[PDB]
Amino acid sequence: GPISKILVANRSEIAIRVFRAANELGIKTVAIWAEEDKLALHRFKADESYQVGRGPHLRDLGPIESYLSIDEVIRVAKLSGADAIHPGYGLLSESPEFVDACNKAGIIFIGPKADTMR
Amino acid sequence: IEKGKTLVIVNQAVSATDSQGMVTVFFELNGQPRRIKVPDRAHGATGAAVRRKAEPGNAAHVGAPMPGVISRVFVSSGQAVDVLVSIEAETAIHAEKDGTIAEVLVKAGDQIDAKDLLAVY
Amino acid sequence: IEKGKTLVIVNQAVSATDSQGMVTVFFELNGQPRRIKVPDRAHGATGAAVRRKAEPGNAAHVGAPMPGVISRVFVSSGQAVDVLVSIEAETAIHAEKDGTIAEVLVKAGDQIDAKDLLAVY
Ligand SMILES: [Cl-]
C-alpha cells in the first residue's frame, strides 16, 4: 500500500517543510512535540500531533532529548497509525538504530537503509 | 477536542466591565491571542451584547468606517447625500445616499469600533 | 438648601457594582449614615434597579420576611396554604393562603432583603 500517513520525527521549519509536501500529495501528517514545544507552530500544521518525553510511562526527558527518544517516536507512530516516518535533518536522521527500530515496527523509514548509514 | 488535537489555553488578562456590560478575557490559544467577550451577569448585565452591528450588505445601514469616540451627532430624521456624525481619533462621516434616517444608534461621546451601526435609513 | 439650613455631606465609601447593576454610595449626612443606590450606567446598567419589591398591602405578594440568600425554590405554579422557598441566614417561608402562584421572582442562590418580592399569586 502506498504511504498514507507520515509522522515527522522532527520540529520547526523542516517539519513544516515535510508537512507541506505530504499534504500536497494528499498524505496525512503526524507531529510530535516536547512539552517545551507546546506552542511550536509545526505541531499545529500536522493533521494530528502528540507529546513526546513526558508522562507516567517514564523521568521527564529534556527538550531535545524528547525528540531523540527512539522509543517515544515509535510509540507515537504506533498510536497515530503512521505508516512512514520522515526524520527531517539533524536529530535521528542518521541513526541506524532508529532505522532498525522503524524496520522492526513495520514502519517505513524515509531515507537510506541502516547498512548504508553504518 | 479530539485525539491528536490538543489545545493549549492560557488566561492572559481579564478586563474591567465596559460600557456595554461586557468583560473581555484575553486568551492565548495555541500561542495566538484571542479576545472573547461575555456579559458581566455577576454585576447585573444579563440582556447585554449591547451595540449593533452593521450589515456590509445594506444601504439602509450606516456603519462606522473606523474605531473612535463620536464627537458630534448632526442628525435624527432625514436628508440628502451631508455629515451625519463625526468620530474623533475628527472625521466626518457622510451620508452615501438620499433618504430619511429612521434611527440614530448614537449617541455620543460614545466609543465605537469599525462596523458598529451608527444610524439606519 | 435654604438660608440657615446647611448640610454637611461626606463621601465615606463607594461599593462595587452589585448583582442588580447598582452601586451604593455610603454618605455621611449631618453626621448620620445614608446609603444611596444608583445604576452603574458607566458599565452598561441602564435599565436597572432590578428586584421588586413587595407591597405590604396585598395578598397576592410574597415578600421576604428577612435578608439572606435563597437556598431552595419549591414552586412555580400553584397550591395550598406549603413551603414556597427557603432562605439561608434555613427558613422556611410558607404560603399564607390557598392559591395558584403566577410568578416566581426568584430564582435562587440569590441574595435578598426583607420586603423583596419573592412570588406573586
Ligand atoms: Cl535536552
Query: Rounded to whole angstroms, how far apart are CA atoms A32 and A90?
Result: 15
Residue B42: list chain C partners with CB under 8 A.
19
CB A77 within 8 A of CB A7: yes
Amino acid at B38: V
Chains C and A touch (3+ CB pairs under 8 A): no
- 3-class secondary-structure state, position C86: strand
What spacing in Å lies between the alpha carbon of A68 and ligand 1's midpoint? 9
CB B51 within 8 A of CB B35: no
C-alpha cell at A21: 509536501
Domains of chain A: 1-118 (3.40.50.20)
Half-sphere exposure at residue C24, Cβ-oriented, CA atoms within 13 angstroms? 11
Q: How many residues does chain B have?
A: 121
For chain B, breaks with the C atom over 2.5 A from the next N come after 81, 89
Residue ranges with CB less than 5 Å from ion ligand 1: A 62-65
Residue with cell 440568600: C69
Q: How was this structure determined?
A: X-ray
Amino acid at C12: Q
Match domain C50-121 to its CATH number in 3.40.50.11890, 2.40.50.100, 1.10.1530.10, 1.20.1250.20.
2.40.50.100
C-alpha cell at A27: 498524505
Half-sphere exposure at residue A36, Cβ-oriented, CA atoms within 13 angstroms? 11
What spacing in Å lies between the alpha carbon of A77 and ligand 1's midpoint? 21
Q: Does B32 touch chain A (CB under 8 A)?
A: no
C-alpha cell at C101: 402562584
C-alpha cell at C115: 420586603
Nearest to B113, CA basis, from B60, B75, B70: B70
Nearest to B25, CA basis, from B41, B6, B46, B39: B39
Nearest to C104, CA basis, from C92, C113, C116: C116
Distance from CA of A32 to the nearest CA of B (A): 10
Q: Does B53 touch chain C (CB under 8 A)?
A: no
Outline where chain B has alpha helix (H): none
Query: Rounded to whole angstroms, how far apart are CA atoms C85 and C74?
Result: 6
Half-sphere exposure at residue A22, Cβ-oriented, CA atoms within 13 angstroms? 28
Residue B3: list chain A partners with CB under 8 A.
48
Nearest to B37, CA basis, from B14, B65, B67, B9: B14
Query: Rounded to whole angstroms, how far apart are CA atoms A114 and A117?
Result: 5
Torsion of CA C26, C30, C32, C34, to 10 degrees: -30
Strand pairing report for B83-88 and B91-94:
antiparallel
Half-sphere exposure at residue B100, Cβ-oriented, CA atoms within 13 angstroms? 2
C-alpha cell at A23: 499534504
Contact B16 C43 (CB under 8 A): yes
| Alpha-carbon distances of C39 from A49, A67, B106, B121, C25, rounded to whole Å | 50, 58, 20, 32, 11
Amino acid at A16: I
Which H/E stretch holds residue C29?
A: strand C22-29
Contact B3 A49 (CB under 8 A): no
C-alpha cell at C43: 458599565
C-alpha cell at A117: 548509514
